[PDB]
Design a protein around this ligand. Structure first.
Ligand SMILES: O=C(O)c1ccccc1S
Ligand SMILES: O=C(O)c1ccccc1S
Ligand code: EMC
Ligand code: EMC
Ligand SMILES: [Ca+2]
Ligand SMILES: [Ca+2]
Ligand SMILES: [Ca+2]
Ligand SMILES: [Ca+2]
Lengths: 88, 88
């Protein structure tokens, strides 16, 4: 009901809309992450068109080193974005 | 414009609505944190009525030990809530 509570559910909703596409339904593989950024973060982040940019973003977000972005890693990503803007 | 982008701005908006009330306008003191939880997280978290609960929550969220909850500490709090529900 609150605007914060709506944001919490939206974070959960959008992660899983993408993570559930292929393979592990609870983690983002590179193609899932790329589509999430391109479709859902177009006002905040430049569209990803090059493989090396995909690779680098995943390298940055994948803290436990399994090659995918899980929900906790996604939340760290959201923290990164939000802080850059609170800042800009 | 996207539902994710709306969530990112809502997180920024609600933090600052509370953090900007008293003292440091970029950090939540205990009374600011308590009001945020009570007013904005009523579907997710039991209302805070006892001082020891205020104290404990702050103790948990205040990683850099300055006695307040800053925006990065708030994002960790949001991560905690979101993960509990993805889980429930
Ligand atoms: O600037 C960003 O928010 C960012 C985006 C993707 C990967 C790393 C970073 S640090
Ligand atoms: O259960 C929670 O989400 C929580 C809330 C306030 C402080 C610590 C925790 S772990
Ligand atoms: C960069 C203003 Hg949220
Ligand atoms: C506990 C369902 Hg978001
Ligand atoms: Ca997946
Ligand atoms: Ca990972
Ligand atoms: Ca304050
Ligand atoms: Ca602190």
């Amino acid at each position: 009901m609150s605007e914060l509570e709506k944001a919490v559910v939206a974070l959960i909703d959008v992660f899983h809309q993408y993570s559930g596409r292929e393979g592990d339904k609870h983690k983002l593989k590179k193609s899932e992450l790329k589509e999430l950024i391109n479709n859902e973060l177009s006002h905040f982040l430049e569209e990803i068109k090059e493989q090396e940019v995909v690779d680098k973003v995943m390298e940055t977000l994948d803290s436990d080193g399994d090659g995918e972005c899980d929900f906790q890693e996604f939340m760290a990503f959201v923290a990164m974005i939000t802080t850059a803007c609170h800042e800009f």
